[PDB]
Structure 1
Amino acid sequence: ELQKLQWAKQTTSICCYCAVGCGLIVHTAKDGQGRAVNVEGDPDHPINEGSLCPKGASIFQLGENDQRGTQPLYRAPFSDTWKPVTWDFALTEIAKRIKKTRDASFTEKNAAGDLVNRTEAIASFGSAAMDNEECWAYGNILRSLGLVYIEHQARIXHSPTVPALAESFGRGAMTNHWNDLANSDCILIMGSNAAENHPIAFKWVLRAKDKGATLIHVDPRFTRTSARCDVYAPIRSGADIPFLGGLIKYILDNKLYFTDYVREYTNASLIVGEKFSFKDGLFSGYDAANKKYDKSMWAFELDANGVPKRDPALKHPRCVINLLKKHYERYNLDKVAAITGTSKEQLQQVYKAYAATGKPDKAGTIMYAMGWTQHSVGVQNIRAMAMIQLLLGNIGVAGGGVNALRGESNVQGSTDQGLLAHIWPGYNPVPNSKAATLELYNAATPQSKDPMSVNWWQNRPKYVASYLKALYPDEEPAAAYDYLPRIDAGRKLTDYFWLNIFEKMDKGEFKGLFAWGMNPACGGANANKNRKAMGKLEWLVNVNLFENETSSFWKGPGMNPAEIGTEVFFLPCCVSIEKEGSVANSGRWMQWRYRGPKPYAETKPDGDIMLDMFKKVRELYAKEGGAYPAPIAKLNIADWEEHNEFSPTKVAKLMNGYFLKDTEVGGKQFKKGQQVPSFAFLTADGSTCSGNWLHAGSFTDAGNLMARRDKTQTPEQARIGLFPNWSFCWPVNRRILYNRASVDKTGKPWNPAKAVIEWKDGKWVGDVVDGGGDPGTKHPFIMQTHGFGALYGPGREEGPFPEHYEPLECPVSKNPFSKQLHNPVAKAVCDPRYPFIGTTYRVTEHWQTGLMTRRCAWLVEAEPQIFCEISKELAKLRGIGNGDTVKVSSLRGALEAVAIVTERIRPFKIEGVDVHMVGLPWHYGWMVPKNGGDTANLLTPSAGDPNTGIPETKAFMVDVRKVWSHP
């Protein structure tokens, strides 16, 4: 017997850090009644098989940590000290702050006199770190309170590129999953440092290489990933579109595209209208005065039924694929090599290796995470990857996909639950002012006349109805619809997002901010400006594990508590291993985890905090009345609780959904109270509730499918690692999205050795088929209006084909592909005192702003201080030695760091000038540890991308100078 574990209860959990979703085993003393005594990997988990990176591996030290919050703290206006206070006080005083601000700022109708039923004087940030049930509850609390300014993590790294995947494939999600990487024949890692940022991914990447795969890293820097790839190709910052356009030209010129796949399953055959043209860097329909396109100029030619016309022969000159060939002929190897700084020889090596996966018996995957995609053409960068994958037949297949790697453990879930301004849960849009009835709301959903187009979003009215019946089960949906707030139809959508929230705060336009599981004082670009702006709040509720740069901005560097009127409530929540719930990983695996030890001290699960905070607002409205009470008073919170506590199990069953009465649906009888077995059996007429249509199937009458720990696989499942009985993935346990594209029109796999699905004996065998229907009777992209993988994507603001427009403003003057230098539908100062391209990135050992990992002594041990990575060339130029202290400055601020001089950074050759990149981690903050240094976001601009509404954290101009020592 091991003494350490002898009398400890073993429970399972899921890592609280990155979206790999590694399994943990937790040992809790006194058979569960004590503290954690051990946390390590779960040997039985199919993704990590017991392995953990230093973050997962140090969760014992995060949990059992004497620096954690113990109870609510209170900071009174102008006060220079915290005041320890009760939960009853804190949640009573906050309930009063909410109601006061709401009553004082509720608008029942906008200037145009349209029903909006909203507050604009409260914002909320967070959080991808919360459980799926807590995310869903939290959003519904904020909306019942009438908030519209509801944002989180996803906006920063994911929202800028998600449209690329929705336009191309019909969904925004990672197409495949982590185990599936082992089936790839060629892995292109581009805008990802996965060995550092998704480390257990490399179990599966290196297993692909074991079976013959070529691993390719395309990155401005040589990283821990690069060290373990066959091919490291340097690219200068922002040259990705040229790189990918060259590969498109290469695939097309050499006929390396998979014709039968392209002809049947992409929109290659669709006839684009005569009004479509491209000249001089501009598509047709350009309004030069307003810098925006009339996208109707890009419309397909339609047949008598309104269905886009097709030439299956692919000969018609206005076939998408012939227009694609014409568009990419400019992207020759010499121009691409010159602008990327990649050698022509290395371009041909990579192009040849990757385009070889066009053959049906080979699969290629692209892995990207954030990289540099936050800028206005990031979405076109990902569009190009999606197009390359559709040409090579790599969508829907094992070892294929666009593996858009999620960041936070539950950023997939937190997006799924609608913690962004523009979406309800299930990706049903937040209504605008003109959507004055539920009928009008539902009319906006596009229809198809093509009988082979599943066009599944036509089912939306069932999901909206069932979601209203989950919040308000005694109300008719049409009445419930009026309870939820609306954004102004007239207003630019990005006015409701992350960056405008900061801009408004700094104009004094918010009374209240929830900083719920986020560290905006460190995570937001231009920290000096945001730390000042937080002063202009009246009150701030910060819910986190530790005291931090956000909770305590008022006593941060250069601050004077006396002068700062913001009332701060710090509410300590419990770590992942101290609560029950689910997190949805990057592959959409919704994974149930259990409490090990009880919450530390008086800490609480987010669920209890938010439910108690709301219950107090409710009763405080029931006894004083005030602005529009109906939403608050009628919100169904009964279903969220058991034993006077937030119930993960009951919230998860509501999110799945149940029959509110006896219903016949899809030719089947269902009894009242029964769980909805699948979104296929939801109704629009009030027979069903469901908090989230994507969750219908996750928690059935068979039980909690998220909680399944079953490694049972058929030979064909096991061959590609589907693990269909291990937890559950939306939608309805389809592990590989778009898998109908993996078979021919008879239902036979293109690649039998790596079959995903196969038509045997009148059924689909393997994965769950992504769309019902006999072989050859449906288009394979069932969430697309038209049903095809879009090579030509006319919904995109910048055009239907990716085109190089220079993201790097300051050092670049020439676009070799057109006369259009910058994005024509999107001003940096480029002050010559700041000649260097600053960038920020992660290291394996730290998490996000470091709020969590700067409290972990083993992670501080490995990576104790902010550093500055620079080339030997920039070192030599600035007289900087390895280990020297340096000052990094921008127009926005300045900080000190330890110089790391390394050949892992080389100069970029731009128009015959060496341009120098400077690298910093954004993991450091003034609060901890001693001598750790401060946020790299002191240096970054807020300015923000006109399109994505996200500032620049990957290419911002700095200077670096040696800070002098005593001789």
Structure 2
Amino acid sequence: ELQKLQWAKQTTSICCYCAVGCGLIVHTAKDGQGRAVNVEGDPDHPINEGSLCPKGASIFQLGENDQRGTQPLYRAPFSDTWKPVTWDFALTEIAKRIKKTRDASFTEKNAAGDLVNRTEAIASFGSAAMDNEECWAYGNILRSLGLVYIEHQARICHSPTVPALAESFGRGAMTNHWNDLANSDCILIMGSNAAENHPIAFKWVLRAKDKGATLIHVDPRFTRTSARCDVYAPIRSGADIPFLGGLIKYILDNKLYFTDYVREYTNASLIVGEKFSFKDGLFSGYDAANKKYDKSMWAFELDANGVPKRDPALKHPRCVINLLKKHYERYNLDKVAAITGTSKEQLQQVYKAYAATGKPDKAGTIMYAMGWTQHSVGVQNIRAMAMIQLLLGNIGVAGGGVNALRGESNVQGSTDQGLLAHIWPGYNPVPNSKAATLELYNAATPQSKDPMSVNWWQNRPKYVASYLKALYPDEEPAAAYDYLPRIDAGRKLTDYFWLNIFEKMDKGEFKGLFAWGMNPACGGANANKNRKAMGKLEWLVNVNLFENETSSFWKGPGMNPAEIGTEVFFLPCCVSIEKEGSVANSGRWMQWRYRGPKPYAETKPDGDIMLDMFKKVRELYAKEGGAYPAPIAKLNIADWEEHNEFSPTKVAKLMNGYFLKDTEVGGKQFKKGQQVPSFAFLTADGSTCSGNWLHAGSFTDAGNLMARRDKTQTPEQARIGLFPNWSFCWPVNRRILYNRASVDKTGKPWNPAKAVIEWKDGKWVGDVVDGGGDPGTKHPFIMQTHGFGALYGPGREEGPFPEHYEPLECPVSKNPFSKQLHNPVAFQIEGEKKAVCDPRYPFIGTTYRVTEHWQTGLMTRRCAWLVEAEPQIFCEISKELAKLRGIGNGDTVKVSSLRGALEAVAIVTERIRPFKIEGVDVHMVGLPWHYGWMVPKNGGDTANLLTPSAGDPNTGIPETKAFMVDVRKV
């Protein structure tokens, strides 16, 4: 045999890095220490087939790392050293700091006299790197403590995707999945570097090319992705909407739209109301005083029943499709070329290749991530591509869709569990102060009087009731509703999000912060503020694998430990391969993974840390009383625990949900204790509990569907690679969302050779049908109120059509599309300065990743093999800019912005060229954000020293992809 593996037990796992969700094989030494001896790919996994990129292939070095935390550490106020302490001391004292802060800050009623039952004195950050069961438990622990300031990776990552696609299609998630990429006829990779940041995805991209697909990369830089594509086009950072607006105009002029799809399945035919207008960069209903729009001005014209009027002939001048044609008339090739820096020839080449998928039996897909999301127009960037895809009929089809490439292994999951300030688990909103009763909460859901509109959100009362039964099983839902904290109706939602949490922290408004599996000292935009602001905390709890720039912010650059009062608790956690649970990948595949090695040293799984912490808080309240104890005392944690520890299996079964009594639902009858077989069988009357209605169907009486390793497929399924028996995906194992839009009104595939679903005899074969009903009887977008793909989307903060605005720091002084330079409602912090055509900062600044490092590099800067390949922060510049500034390849340079400066190694490359903007050459400076002051030696610090704390008015995502900088030789 092989000596190395001869005395080791084999277990399956799922990669702890990106949301591809590659399968691992872990080899663990059979007895003694019980450490991992080998980690490599799972050859039987249907996504990676045993392949791993360098991050996955090096998990052994991460897991069996001699720099990992071993035991809890305590930093007393003003101290310059850590003190090793017991878990008993660490958790006991943290429980006291929570209780003390909660008791002193707890608010029953706000200024307006409305019940809010919250503490605004504690914030939490993290984490998409925790298991789905841990993320769900964590959120409910925090909410039982009365927290509203609850955030994680999603805010500063794909937060714009959720409303962008929900507005467009009804859901915020990636529409298709990785395997499906192989079915595409044209793959547009734009605002994405998928060959570096989702590497196993290129298995399926290249299989698409094997079958005749055109591969297009549109990126300011020529990357490792660009090297394998058929068409490469440059684009200036922040010029996406002009490029996409130009493609809309191109599709409409040349009649490359899928007419029948557009007419039947989009809101093309809907009559917009008389109060809608746009002139000179501003929509109707603009309120300049309050920096917001009166969205009521964008309402549709309704019939007597309240159903939006439709002209099926598409001739009415206020038809969505005619207002669309009129809006994007301004986006001619000359104007788009002049503002993007992309030649008219390159625009035409991309436009022609992509818009060819307007043909019914041809599928085009978009792969995008942070190059689109991390902007002041992040939501509108994505809206524009959603609209393009609806025009070409690419939504719901194999090789089509909007593939929003999620980041972390479980960021899909962590968003699903409501680790954001505006959402409970399952995208049920956090109540505002005016939602005084469960009844009023439920009243907010719009109804539809259209007999073809499923309007599936009408079932929300069942999900909210079943969620409240999961947490508070002995209370009536309408009673337990009063246990959970509410946000103020009077405020912009962005008041409760990441950037404003750091602004409030900088003004002393926070006593306590959980940095739970995040490194905000490096990952948060405008990092110098974040590093100062954490100085204003009385206490900080950091839960992570290694000591880091957040845990040890107090001994960071230019900091005096003697002057910093912050009490810090470092709690070392287990790595992915040392624990059991599920992680939801980009395609919503919820995959179960197992324990290989025992926990390293005295490290603990997050599940156990948060549960023992909460138990100490609960027992403190049971002894000495305090502020509104009921939500803490009454929380059902019995169902989270087995053999004195966190039970991923039991939690997963509660998240699926079970009957609290004998129940009759949907014609069937259920015994008390049975698992809910799907969210179809949840009730509003208290008969059912379910931690997350999306998980209903994931863990039934049949067993853990997330643990299925079945690659068998029907011939229909196998033609497109659904793999519906491999793990489980929400909702109810629908692998391609909106798949009713992939067939005509009789149920016949547009592309029978790549059918997603087909009506045969009297049933849908292939994928699970997304919305029940015979062919032609239902609008295909069942999560939309009206049932249509929204070309016109009036729910978005800065308008129902995307419109070009320049980045808040931009290299141009005049918008060629209007007299509005910037997003007229952009999230900004008053007094914070922006370099708009400032000669001190004349270069475009952008930040991005390399294949070999992960996030802030907290994990990968500890891994010698990844440091080997990418040892130091670098600065990528053109030969033209290198010559202008007298920088040679390999020289030390200083990159500076209004907010900070750092040193990096110049990489002078032909892979970057000037952007000719209005006939003038504009230079860019590119930086990886993977480096931090702690490790390694000469590695450098975070690119987030330079980035602005401003961005998207929908989601508050920072504009980390387009700002302004200077670069000087050192």
Q: CA deviation at 1:894?
A: 1.6
Distance 1:892 1:286, change over 3 A: closer
Deviations 1:11-35 (A, max 9, x none): 0000000110000000001169711
Residues 32 and 357 of structure 1: CA distance in aligned 2, closer, same or farther (over 3 Å) = farther
Contact 1:341 1:909 (8 Å CA) reproduced: yes
| Counterpart contact for 2:157–2:370, Cα < 8 Å | yes
Q: Distance in 2 between the 1:429 and 1:815 partners? A: 36
What SS does structure 1 have at the residue aligned with 2:390?
helix
- Give the structure-2-normalised TM-score: 0.98
**What do residues 761-806 of structure 1 show as CA deviations (whole Å, max 9, x unaligned)?**
2111000000011111110000000000001111112221112222
Kept after mapping to 1: 8 A contact 2:835/2:898: no
> How many Å separate the matches in 1 of 2:542 and 2:293?
42
Distance in structure 2 (CA, Å) of the matches to 1:619 and 1:292: 46
Q: What is the SS of the residue equivalent to 1:180?
A: helix
Residues 819 and 77 (structure 1), Cα distance of their counterparts in 2 relative to 1, 3 Å cut: closer
Does the Cα contact within 8 Å between 1:374 and 1:948 map onto a contact in 2?
no
Residue 469 and residue 365 in structure 1: after superposition, are their counterparts in 2 closer, same or farther (change >3 A)?
A: same
For the residue of structure 2 that corresponds to 1:898, the secondary structure is strand
| 1:46-101 Cα deviation digits (max 9, x unpaired) | 00001100000000000001100000001101111110000011000111010000
Contact 1:9 1:31 in 2 (8 A): no
| 8 Å Cα contact 2:370-2:961 kept in structure 1 | no
SS at match of 2:615: helix
Once the two structures are overlaid, the 10-residue window that deviates more, 729-738 or 28-37, is: 28-37
Q: Specify whether residues 943 and 336 from structure 1 end up closer, same or farther in structure 2 by C-alpha distance, changes over 3 A only.
A: closer
Match of 1:840 among 836, 847, 853: 847
> After superposition, what is the alpha-carbon deviation per residue over 1:871-923, rounded to whole angstroms, capped at 9, x for unaligned?
11111111111111111122222211111100111111123322211111110
The whole-number CA distance in structure 1 between the counterparts of 2:504 and 2:66 is 37
**1:376–1:947 CA contact under 8 A, matched in 2:** no
Say which SS state the counterpart of residue 483 (structure 2) adopts: coil
User: More deviation in 264-273 or 26-35?
Assistant: 26-35
Shift of residue 538, structure 1, vs aligned partner = 0.5
Report the Cα offset of residue 291 of structure 1.
Answer: 4.1
SS in 2 for 1:91: helix
Bigger mean CA deviation after superposition, 479-488 or 944-953:
944-953
Give me the whole-angstrom Cα distance separating, in 1, the residues matched to 2:283 and 2:616: 55
Give the match for residue 909 of structure 1: 916
Cα drift, residue 950 of structure 1:
3.2
Contact 1:108 1:115 in 2 (8 A): yes
From 893, 897, 919, give the equivalent of 1:886: 893
| Contact 1:454–1:778, Cα closer than 8 Å, also in 2 | yes
* DSSP 3-state at the match of 2:409: coil
CA deviation map 1:327-348 (0-9, x unaligned): 2222111111121111111111
2:861 aligned partner: 854
Offset at residue 830 of structure 1 (A)? 5.0
Q: CA deviation at 1:596?
A: 0.3
CA distance in 2, matches of 1:294, 1:884: 53
Please tell me whether the aligned partners of residues 118 and 147 of structure 1 are also in contact (alpha carbons under 8 angstroms): yes
- Structure 2 residue matching 1:27: 3-state secondary structure: strand
Distance 2:465 2:875 in 1: 53
Equivalent residues of 1:144, 1:632 under 8 A apart: yes
Asked if 2 retains the 8 angstrom alpha-carbon contact of 1:237 and 1:808, the reply is no
Q: Following TM superposition, by how much is the alpha carbon of 1:384 offset from its aligned partner in structure 2, in angstroms?
A: 0.8
Whether 1:418 and 2:425 are equivalent positions in the alignment is no
Q: What is residue 100 of structure 2 aligned with on the other side?
A: 100
CA contact (8 A) 1:148 1:486 kept: yes
Offset, 1:683: 0.1
Contact 1:125 1:514 in 2 (8 A): yes
Name the CA shift for 1:907/1:537 in 2 (closer, same or farther; >3 Å).
same
TM-aligned CA distance change 1:68 to 1:483, over 3 Å? same
**Residues 160 and 375 in structure 1, CA contact (< 8 A), matched pair in contact too:** no
Post-superposition CA distance 1:604-627 (Å, at most 9, x none) = 000000000000000011000011
Counterpart secondary structure, 1:406: coil
Deviation at 1:3, TM superposition (A): 1.3
Deviation at 1:483, TM superposition (A): 0.4
> How far apart are residue 746 of structure 1 and its match?
0.8
- Cα gap change, 1:806/1:489 in structure 2, threshold over 3 Å: closer, same or farther? same
8 Å Cα contact 1:739/1:770 also seen in 2: yes
CA gap of 1:792–1:944, structure 2 versus 1, over 3 A, is closer
- Distance in 2, matches of 1:3 and 1:422, equals 53
SS of the residue corresponding to residue 423 of structure 1 reads coil
Return closer, same or farther for 1:293/1:793 CA change in 2, 3 Å cut-off.
same
Q: 1:312 deviation in Å?
A: 1.3
Matches of 1:358 and 1:830, distance apart in 2: 40
Moved more, 296-305 or 70-79: 296-305
Tell me the secondary structure at the aligned position of residue 807 of structure 1. coil
CA drift of 1:947 comes to 4.9
Given that 1:68 and 1:546 are in contact with CA atoms closer than 8 Å, whether structure 2 keeps it comes out as yes
CA contact (8 A) 2:779 2:787 kept: yes
Number of residues of Structure 1 aligned to a counterpart in Structure 2: 963
Deviation per residue, 1:820-848 (Å, 9 max, x gap) = 33223335465422221221110000000
How far 1:559 sits from its partner (Å)?
A: 1.2
| Aligned residues of 2:376 and 2:959 also touching (Cα < 8 A) | no
CA shift at 1:7, angstroms? 1.7
Contact 1:11 1:595 survives alignment (8 Å): yes
CA contact (8 A) 2:812 2:837 kept: no
Is the 1:834–1:959 contact (alpha carbons within 8 Å) kept by the matching residues of 2? yes
Compute the RMSD of aligned alpha carbons: 1.2
Change (3 A) 1:346 1:888: same
C-alpha displacement of 1:292: 2.9
Distance in 1 (CA, whole Å) between partners of 2:545 and 2:936 is 16
Q: Does 1:874 align with 2:885?
A: no
Is this contact kept in 2: 1:32–1:597, CA < 8 A? no
Structure 1 range deviating more: 293-302 or 547-556: 293-302
Give 3-state SS (helix, strand or coil) of 1:447's partner.
coil
| Residue-by-residue CA offset, 1:431-450 (whole Å, 9 max, x unaligned) | 01110100000000110000
Q: Secondary structure at the match of 2:31?
A: helix
- Structure 1 segments unaligned to the other structure (5+ residues): none
How far apart are the structure 2 equivalents of 1:694 and 1:31?
A: 40
Structure 2: distance between partners of 1:863 and 1:815: 39
Equivalent pair of 1:71/1:602 in contact (CA under 8 Å): yes
Question: How far has the Cα of 1:134 moved from its partner?
Answer: 0.1
Do the aligned partners of 2:185 and 2:214 also contact (CA within 8 Å) in 1? yes
Shift of 1:116: 0.6
8 Å CA contact retained: 1:551, 1:570: yes
SS of equivalent residue, structure 2 residue 600: coil
Distance 1:738 1:37 in 2: 44
Q: 1:289 Cα deviation (Å)?
A: 4.2
Partners in 2 of 1:680 and 1:949 — Cα distance?
34
Q: Contact conserved, 2:379 with 2:952, CA < 8 A, in 1?
A: no
Whole-Å separation in 1 of the counterparts to 2:505 and 2:455:
41
By how many angstroms is 1:315 displaced?
1.8
Measure how far apart 1:285 and its partner are: 2.5
TM-score normalized by the length of structure 1: 0.98
Distance 1:808 1:139, change over 3 A: closer
Once residues 635 and 894 of structure 1 are traced to their aligned partners in structure 2, the CA distance between those partners, rounded to angstroms, is 47
> Take 1:32 and 1:358, find their aligned partners in 2: how far apart are those partners?
62
Q: Structure 1's 309 and 819: CA in aligned 2 closer, same or farther, altered over 3 A? A: same
Q: Deviations over 1:577-609 (max 9, x none)?
A: 000000000000000000001100100000000
Aligned counterparts of 1:772 and 1:33: Cα–Cα separation in 2? 53
User: Cα deviation per residue 1:384-437 (whole Å; 9 max; x = unaligned)?
Assistant: 100110010100000000000001110000000000000000000000111010
Q: Deviations for 1:664-721, whole angstroms, at most 9, x for unmatched residues?
A: 0000000000000000000000000000000000000010000000001011101101
What's the offset of the Cα at 1:267? 0.6
After superposition, give the CA deviation of every residue in 1:160-189 in whole Å (9 maximum; x if it has no partner).
232110000000000000000000000001
**Is the 1:164–1:380 contact (alpha carbons within 8 Å) kept by the matching residues of 2?**
yes
Which residue is equivalent to 1:944? 951
Q: Work out whether residues 811 and 964 of structure 2, in 8 Å CA contact, stay in contact via their aligned partners in 1.
A: no
Greater shift in the superposed pair: 493-502 or 32-41: 32-41
- What stretches of structure 1 move > 6 A for 4+ residues in a row? none
The 3-state SS of whatever aligns with 1:415 is helix
Query: Aligned partners of 1:506 and 1:404: how far apart in 2?
Result: 33
SS in 1 for 2:26: strand
CA distance in 1 between counterparts of 2:135 and 2:32 reads 27
Does the 8 Å CA contact 2:759/2:765 hold for their aligned counterparts?
A: yes
